[PDB]
Amino acid sequence: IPASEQETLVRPKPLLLKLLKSVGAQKDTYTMKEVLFYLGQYIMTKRLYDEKQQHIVYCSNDLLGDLFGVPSFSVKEHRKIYTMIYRNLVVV
Ligand SMILES: CC[C@@H]([C@H](C)O)N1C(=O)[C@@](C)(CC(=O)O)C[C@H](c2cccc(Cl)c2)[C@H]1c1ccc(Cl)cc1
């Protein structure tokens, strides 16, 4: 994952926007660096990720699960994460 991908501008779909607004100000367009930070913040504040449970995020009991279509995922599989995130946004 090139660092250039983080500058990419995107517009979250309704569900993802609903998630993002619980941790950050609503915007029409976000850079991927913002989307990833806010998503990562949403995960930590809701403790869907216990750093003690070996890099796996558990989201079957959260909207995040409905967004990503999975019950859990590793914080280390970044390409998979990006694909799941793209399913929920539209590139500018
Ligand atoms: C939820 C944990 C979060 C913390 C806040 O930085 N996080 C990590 O813990 C990491 C250090 C896990 C790792 O690769 O070892 C980085 C991770 C991340 C950062 C930028 C892009 C991606 Cl796809 C993942 C990143 C992350 C960000 C968003 C999601 Cl959806 C998942 C993981």
Could you tell me the domains of the chain? 1-92 (1.10.245.10)
Experimental method: X-ray
Resolution in A: 2.0
* DSSP letter assigned to residue 36: H
Ligand 1 pocket test: pick from 72, 73, 75 the residue with the most ligand atoms within 8 Å of its Cβ.
Answer: 75
The structure tokens 């869907």 sit at: 48
CA of 40 to the centre of ligand 1 (A): 6
Contact 21, 11 (CB under 8 A): no
Q: Which among 25, 34, 28 has a CA at the least distance from the CA of 6?
A: 34
CB 13 within 8 A of CB 39: no
Beta bridge partners of residue 12, listed in sequence order: 89
Phi, psi angle pair for 27, to nearest 5°: -135, 155
The separation between the first and the last C-alpha atoms of the chain, rounded to the nearest angstrom, is 19
| DSSP letters spanning 37-71 | HHHHHHHHHTTS--TTSTTEEE-TTSHHHHHHTSS
Q: Could you give the CA distance from residue 20 to residue 16 in angstroms, rounded to a whole number?
A: 6
- Could you say which DSSP state residue 77 is in? -
39 lines ligand 1 (CB under 6 A): yes
